[PDB]
Amino acid sequence: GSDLGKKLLEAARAGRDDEVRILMANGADVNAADVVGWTPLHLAAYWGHLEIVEVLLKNGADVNAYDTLGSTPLHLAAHFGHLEIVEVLLKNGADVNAKDDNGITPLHLAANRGHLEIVEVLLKYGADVNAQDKFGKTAFDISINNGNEDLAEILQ
Amino acid sequence: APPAVTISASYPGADAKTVQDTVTQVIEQNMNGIDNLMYMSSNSDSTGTVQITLTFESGTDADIAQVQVQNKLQLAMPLLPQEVQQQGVSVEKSSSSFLMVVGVINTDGTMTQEDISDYVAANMKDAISRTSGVGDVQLFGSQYAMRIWMNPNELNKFQLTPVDVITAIKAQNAQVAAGQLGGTPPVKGQQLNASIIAQTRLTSTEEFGKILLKVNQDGSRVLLRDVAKIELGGENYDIIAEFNGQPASGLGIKLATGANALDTAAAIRAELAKMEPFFPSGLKIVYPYDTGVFMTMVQLPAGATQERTQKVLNEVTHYYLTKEKNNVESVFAVNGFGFAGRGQNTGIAFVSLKDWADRPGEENKVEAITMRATRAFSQIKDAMVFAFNLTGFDFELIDQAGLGHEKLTQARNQLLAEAAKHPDMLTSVRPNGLEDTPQFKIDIDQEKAQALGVSINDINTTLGAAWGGSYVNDFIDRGRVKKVYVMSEAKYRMLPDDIGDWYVRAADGQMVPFSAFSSSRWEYGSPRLERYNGLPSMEILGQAAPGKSTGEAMELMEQLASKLPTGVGYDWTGMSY
Amino acid sequence: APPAVTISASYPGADAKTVQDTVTQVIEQNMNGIDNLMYMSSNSDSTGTVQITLTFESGTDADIAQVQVQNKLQLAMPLLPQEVQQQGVSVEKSSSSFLMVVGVINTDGTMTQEDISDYVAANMKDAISRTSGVGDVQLFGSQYAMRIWMNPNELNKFQLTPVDVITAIKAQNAQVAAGQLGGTPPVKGQQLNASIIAQTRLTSTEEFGKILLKVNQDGSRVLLRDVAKIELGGENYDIIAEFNGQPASGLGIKLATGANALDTAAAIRAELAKMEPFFPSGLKIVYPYDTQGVFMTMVQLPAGATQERTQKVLNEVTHYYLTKEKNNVESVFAVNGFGFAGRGQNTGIAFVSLKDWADRPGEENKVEAITMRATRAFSQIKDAMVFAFNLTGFDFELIDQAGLGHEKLTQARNQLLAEAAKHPDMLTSVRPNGLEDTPQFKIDIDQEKAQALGVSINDINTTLGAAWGGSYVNDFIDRGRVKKVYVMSEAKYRMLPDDIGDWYVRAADGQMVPFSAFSSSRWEYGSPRLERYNGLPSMEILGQAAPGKSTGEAMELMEQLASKLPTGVGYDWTGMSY
Amino acid sequence: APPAVTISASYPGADAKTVQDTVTQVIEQNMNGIDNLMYMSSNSDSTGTVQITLTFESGTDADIAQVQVQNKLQLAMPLLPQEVQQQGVSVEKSSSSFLMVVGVINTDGTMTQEDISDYVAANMKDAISRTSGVGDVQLFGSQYAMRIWMNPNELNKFQLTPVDVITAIKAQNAQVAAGQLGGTPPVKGQQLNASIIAQTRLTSTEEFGKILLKVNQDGSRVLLRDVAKIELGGENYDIIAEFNGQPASGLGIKLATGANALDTAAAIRAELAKMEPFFPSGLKIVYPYDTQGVFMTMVQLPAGATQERTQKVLNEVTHYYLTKEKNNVESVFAVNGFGFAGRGQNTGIAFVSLKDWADRPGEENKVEAITMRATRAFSQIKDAMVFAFNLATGFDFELIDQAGLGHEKLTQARNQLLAEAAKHPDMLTSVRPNGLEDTPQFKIDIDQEKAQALGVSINDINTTLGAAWGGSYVNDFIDRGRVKKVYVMSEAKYRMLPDDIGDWYVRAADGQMVPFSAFSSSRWEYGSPRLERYNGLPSMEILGQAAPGKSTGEAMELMEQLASKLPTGVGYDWTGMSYQ
Ligand SMILES: CC1(C)Cc2c(C#N)c(SCCc3ccccc3)nc(N3CCOCC3)c2CO1
Known about the structure:
part of a larger assembly, 4 chains, A: 53% helix, binds ligand 5QG, bile acid transmembrane transporter activity (chain C), Multidrug efflux pump subunit AcrB (chain C), cell inner membrane (chain C), xenobiotic transmembrane transporter activity (chain C), transport protein
């Protein structure tokens, strides 16, 4: 596709908000994907760069882009405790029950790292509380296994 | 220059964090009671390599330093993983540079670099090691290993795994004491005395191919060649070397302390002349460096492969061999090697010039050549490629409070972003190391493995042995002891989907695929972890702006450094100590 | 002084005889071919520890001696138990006395004695140990390990044993080399190269707690936290320290043979000044013993004395310096469990620091008079040798020359001591330097009964040892630092003889078998500290010339007395008497 | 003479090739990057022994040479077989020849050769070995081990194997770390603190004999003494010494490189003086070789020769000095199974001590005249190189395999060079190999397909074979307070003839006893009982003399012309006297 594709992946990767605007403006493919299938929105979501997430979404970035293992930007934001990104992704239409190749959902991941504020927002937006991964496990099983009583309360 | 000792260890198939936390930390923690130590630095990388460099006070006797470091390392050896102990952990004086680099090439296209490396190992290196005034000699490549390249589909067909393969090779490529008939103490009057000779080490691909893995219930035999391809090959494949586009190996030769350079160089050249009658066809000796060699760095992006780097190095070689045909004798292209990082995405070209007197005029001097090379290489896409001939400062950012790699990177980026705000005082303030890159995280599900009766050892040996390789034991090749390695044939260990082609046998004999008890995902992590005086570190280089002193640049770095998050410290090293 | 090289090694849960016979004898037998060795001595202790002291002729290059020693030891390492090898054997070339002590307290009481000791172990000790001139560093405390405190009732409920716990920890707290995607040699056209990351070391009690021991036949899960309490705690619990009565830890530092005291102390201070800014709040360095304005006090209780009775005596010592001598004494740093020469529940040391000389005017407020008064004040403490000393009669070794054994050598020692007590005009205070035998719990495993039940001896001995002695399983990463993991019974299931009967082992047929079905036990005596001298069993005797009598006359009488000892008992002079 | 560091290792029951290929080569490959090294040589023997000699430039600091050798050795140590590591690999910096021999005898004849050798190993050797200036100490004999001599009929009668014996010994001769009652951290208030003492090492044959191998279904017990004889005995039985025909042991002592001979000898005597008052009755030190006054006699039979045939030649030598030279000779200390090239069944040595200078008047009664007559009298002993001498025109030649030709081709080549040197008596005298010839060996092939089919494991097959016919060091025990080894091996009468292979049974997975003959075949073949290597390549040392009046220079030069015509791949180098 584009040389600016790769520059945008790199700039989103490294949190360079200004370099990201300038590249958006010059036609850089907003859904350019690297070798593992990560888009700028994936990278910005994983590394916690909120402004870049926002700029990209406004420029039409595919909110539900999936990587080669089926994981979406919301999987990454939920897993790495980035609350304000989780909220924006879900507001711009992120699929709250997206499953990866393993059947893992953003809820499973937030639950596993005990990100409680994130777990609440996911349930706010309709996250399926009884979704099973390929092993039969729910967010509730994950709370029991990790002995995280606060998270057990929240999932009843 | 202050004397330095380097400890080198290798853990095949290990990632940077595995190496650090099972080797590097353990060794660092045992570097006490050593005299005259100024500082210690280490790096641990994704090629399974650790290097710990100890730097001693100027005037320290380097041999005493070496021996003290050695003894402490050797006492710590039982604390290290078996796989690392079996590779040898070397402790060498690292301060000195090469007397000469000797290239060994094949010109008539009959021999791979592994063939050549083996020839050198077996016929050349030892006679060079014993030559007058020679010290350390490094081989560039290895002697052959017997390579067993496994096929998962054939293994699953016959309900076998890599574990069965490794067990069978230990059992059938063996050599043990069997005693004697009529040995002492004997029945008195015994006339017959003879050694008993039982199994002996295997000597060839044919013999390995006949290893019996299993007799089926129908009475058919499964032999090792039915689940694997079998060849003599390299111990490892991280480096590809060419000399003017031809396959190469070589020797890196060091001068013994208090020996003469010119007499040693002539004594080596003489010794190498004696061997020339015995070469096979087209083997040839070349001398890329001997007491105007410059270098060209090649750096591809995160995740880039050996083949992509090779393509770029090939463009670099072709350029010097055509656009500088009047100036350039040779290009020695080393794919997988850099200073500041090994890996599939780096390489370095050693360019050797023709004589001063055959390059008249300033256009044909090194400085003009290098600037032209750099201008030409600037229009290669998706590679940074820099020609250079071999002031600054050397800073270490230090994790002082158990912050972890991720928080240390964020502090590093806080300092680098601040140093950029003062271009009046500082320029080119940059990491010396590497950035985190995508990695494939596989979780084994312990409950599923238990339910199914799949053992975790079987799981982890199957994954490790197939995808990383395993040094099983030794064999004898044309009378010389050499290693035996099991690994997946390349096309079954390339991509995530290949993980599910590998099967493990449960306790009830059913074959279970990897996907039944595992899940995976992409994440970032480090391909090269750095430590300084036993603590996690990130080295940062830089220089004073124009018309400012190094001392002034340092003062600002310290001041910027005082504003970093809690638990982040620093120290000055190297040129800046 | 004759240079001394010291080898130290450890075997967790081993008694003196075990240490002596699997470690000490083996190292000793292999100290051949070393130049200028004058003599060799060793202790094998019921703390699971051995110290071998090799003393070289005067003028020997200590560098060379250390190296020659380390090289012989390296060649013997494969003959030692895996449990000892894996602790790390150390070899040192240093003074036996302390150059200085670095104390560490928490001024805001935010951190316990145990937290502080770990902070010191984990953040300060190694850089101090790498400082040039630093010969030996003793932590006055222990680094944390991950402690798995097993409950035998809960293990038996789920038909598990410590063997199953250990197996599961090694399998689930693992660091796995998994290779790469697109690894070399690659296929043609490969675009992706990435490390594969599988299992990594666990980092938290949470993680160890969810180690999955087993899935019951009804599908429920038995996690490690269901049979154990999981906490960070010391690799050992033997050494506790206080600074002016407050919780403390610290580093006792000994000068490397031939090093410069003053430069080494300065380098140590320079290194501590690099660490101070990153301390957690409250943490503070104090300087309780800088070597004339300082002295020590030794506390030796008889073997068999416990941590609490040693503590009681240390409290009396500390109290005296902080009440009676408060106009002269600035501080006391007291260590329970360490005693200058040796390490044990029955021993302690106090490091005393005086106020400025200028503010202690008068002969009666100088070191000599103070130590002398303190020795007098402590001379009437019951069943404790307590003495204050700044830092010569005779030093005698009774030697087992003919395989006589411990018991006979003790009788022979006692005969010589009794004979020497009957010459009070010639000899004074002729005494053992070592320890008396004490009660020990002898347990006999019935091999016939184990085999009849299908119980494996290795499971029995691993069960006994791991529970009652502790077992170092493998390593984990605590806040980025490699540290150890230990399994052991929780305290309350390993206190009394009846507790033996509550440990169960699983037979080949799946039945749980109590230890009482295949064992029997009795009380007996044995040694908490076995000594050797030049490779043979030995007993060190100290003493002096009586008043008005020469050392050489006293020695001559000791030789006379020694010549009438039972057959096979020899002797030799060492130390000051060589 | 140039300084030499020596690496020595042992692999019990190993043949020469096995030693070479699992031990010697692995070490050798690391011996480079060592300062002032001139050359390296090695022997790998069918006694299961390897010795590598690294020879340094004159004036090299021996302390540093030893250090640097050992640091390269450490790279090979974890690649070595565990049976080698466990024997204790040694690295020494000694002179190659003896400074003195300390003899030990029992004037009351109440102790055998075996008893005496054990007493010396257990109470005397270590302290000598620790003495400064002592480079190497050789025991003429062997320390006692606990010997379990297995009987294969009795083992098969109870469905047991050596694997079971070895397993039981490891389980029941054990030293257990069992912790404490009331240890730390305690329940606060705990008063009781006591060490737990569980199993401890066995100390006696009686305790070994009652080891419980199994309980039958009927409840009867199979004890280790029901399948083996149990006694104290040598770790090995290869070295046997006599002093004036009387049972003896001793220490052969070599001087550490650069150490003072007088000083060192004196400290050895001082240390012996500490031991003497505690000797059992009858025991006494004798001094059969102080370094004219003395000389040695070397005895070398051809490979294949047993202890019996070597003893015979030694008796003829000893008989000579006690009958014919009885007015000159005070004492003969004769050692069967150890000679100049170290250990082997076909070698021996006599140390001869003469009476006082002044009780031997006349030039024919001096060392030179005596050794000449002895060498003369011994020259007609057949199948024996016997000579007497007291400690030059010669050359030291190394034939080297430089192309992977293998041992058989290198022999062929050697024979070709030796035959052509025989046709030049004008220039070359006594051109001979320094080494040993190939001898018959019993080659046994495990059939993997049969083993797998019957369900017998290969480790079980190999242990059974190795332990029975070679012996196996199981673990340690305590003999009269001293750590010592425990060995299992077949009783002699079950490991003497080829048919004995078939009386050893291995137990399959299904419980069936399977004789060795069901999964094995065998044949005679030839191989080497001493493989030599020079600078890391297979080699064959050839010795010889400049013919009368001709220079070493001219004889060396001829040997080069002869060598130049040898097959492709075969090279040479000069070592020792010929190096410079
Ligand atoms: C003096 C200089 C700068 C010159 C110099 C040259 C040249 N010319 C080469 S040539 C490439 C040889 C080779 C062949 C196969 C595999 C790896 C390397 N290689 C060097 N290396 C040093 C570290 O190990 C290998 C690379 C150096 C470093 O010192």
